Design a protein around this nucleic acid. Structure first.
Ligand SMILES: Nc1ncnc2c1ncn2[C@@H]1O[C@H](COP(=O)(O)OP(=O)(O)OP(=O)(O)O)[C@@H](O)[C@H]1O
Ligand SMILES: [Mg+2]
Ligand SMILES: [Mg+2]
Length: 373
DNA sequence: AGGACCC
DNA sequence: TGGGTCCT
């Protein structure tokens, strides 16, 4: 149970794909999916015309005045298609980890070993790659790690084919020996293509990044820290004193991220299974006057009740989240949480009242059910 | 409850 | 600055 073969599957412009399937007439039009004042994503036609992920509508339309916009505030259809993709990949191999609605990791190691035991000491020399090899690296058919990663690429090509044939969806895949690398390599050829990373090109991929922030695992706060410390490139992080890093970020963060900077990442692909929470949100200018807007809270409620029904399991906890007024101090939302009574688990209106009291304990309103059982 | 990370 | 995860 040593060396792994992991695939990362990463769909193209996922919300825009879902909307193009729904309304074919948007098919070869540049398309942006809007949420409030943002174009959260857009199809590849629009990316050619300058439209970028998460651009304001204004910038978006004065870069491209012919841009078609559809509202993507209601996530229902995205969410449903997102689970269809996960279940299809689960069928290839059951340990599938979701990351957001349109990325999945699959640990292919058992699958690859089983396919390999199937082949003769004849056809092992006909093993070929499917799709791109990162950095155009030469394959060595006598290297058992090259052979396993190639079989990995063939399984990823089957997955992408099946997603297209069964669900109508295109996507990228990256095959590598761990989740970090699979995730960095999946993005090298886009849209709708795949890439496999052989071990000798690992430093090349890692040093191809232009800032430590691009490392999956290193976010906004951590990047700001490393900066303050004079750490900008992936090589700065590789060569920095482990000790000062430790005595500044904590042992956990320091040792994990410095391993990341080498391309090293032991984290297991984790079975996501069914979701741990269910929530819906609503943004607005500053429209929750702090009074008559429980009305919002009932709408949110009605949808969530229909969803959390549908699941089979039921939530034992409810939470209310808010965002307070005026100026924008970069970190700060607030939440009141209490258990749901069992009278009420097993007829909207008692739920309506719990929510209102937690409101009374305390631009954004959301309800979240959790602690599913 | 809130932080930090992800898409 | 419309969702989700897991750690502190
Ligand atoms: N910050 C965000 N706010 C709202 N929705 C988001 C946000 N980040 C991502 N999404 C949504 O999640 C989906 C997947 O995100 P992702 O970063 O993979 O981009 P994508 O739209 O699939 O484009 P690409 O082809 O580059 O992968 C999108 O279609 C959108
Ligand atoms: Mg992605
Ligand atoms: Mg994507």
């Amino acid at each position: 149970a040593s060396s792994r073969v992991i695939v990362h599957v990463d769909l193209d412009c996922f919300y825009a794909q879902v909307e193009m399937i729904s309304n074919p007439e948007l098919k070869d039009k540049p398309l942006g999916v809007q949420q409030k004042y943002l174009v959260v994503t857009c199809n590849y036609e629009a990316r050619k015309l300058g439209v970028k992920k998460l651009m304001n509508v204004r910038d978006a339309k004065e870069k491209c005045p012919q841009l078609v916009l559809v509202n993507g505030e209601d996530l229902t259809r995205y969410r449903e298609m997102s689970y269809k993709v996960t279940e299809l990949l689960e069928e290839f191999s059951p340990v599938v980890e979701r990351l957001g609605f349109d990325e999945n990791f699959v640990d292919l190691t058992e699958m690859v070993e089983k396919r390999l035991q199937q082949l003769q000491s004849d056809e092992l020399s006909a093993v070929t790659v499917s799709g791109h090899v990162y950095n155009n690296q030469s394959i060595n058919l006598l290297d058992v790690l090259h052979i396993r990663l190639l079989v990995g690429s063939q399984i990823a090509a089957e997955m992408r084919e099946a997603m297209y044939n069964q669900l109508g969806l295109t996507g990228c895949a990256g095959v590598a020996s761990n989740k970090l690398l699979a995730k960095l390599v999946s993005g090298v050829f886009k849209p709708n293509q795949q890439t496999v990373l052989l071990p000798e090109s690992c430093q090349h991929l890692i040093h191809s990044l232009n800032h430590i922030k691009e490392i999956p695992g290193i976010g906004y706060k951590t990047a700001k820290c490393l900066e303050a410390l004079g750490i900008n490139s992936v090589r700065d992080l590789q060569t920095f004193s482990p000790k000062i890093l430790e005595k500044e970020l904590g042992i956990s963060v320091a040792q994990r991220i410095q391993k990341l900077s080498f391309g090293e990442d032991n984290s297991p692909v984790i079975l996501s299974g069914p979701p741990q929470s269910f929530s819906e949100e609503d943004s607005f200018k500053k429209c929750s006057s702090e009074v008559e807007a429980k009305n919002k809270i009932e709408e949110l409620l009605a949808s969530l009740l229909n969803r959390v029904c549908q699941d089979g399991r039921k939530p034992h906890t409810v939470r209310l989240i808010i965002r307070r007024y005026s100026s924008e101090k970069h970190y700060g939302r607030e939440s009141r949480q209490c258990p749901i009574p069992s009278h009420v688990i097993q007829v909207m209106t008692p739920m309506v009242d719990i929510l209102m009291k937690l409101f009374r304990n305390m631009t954004l309103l959301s309800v979240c059910f959790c602690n599913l059982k």
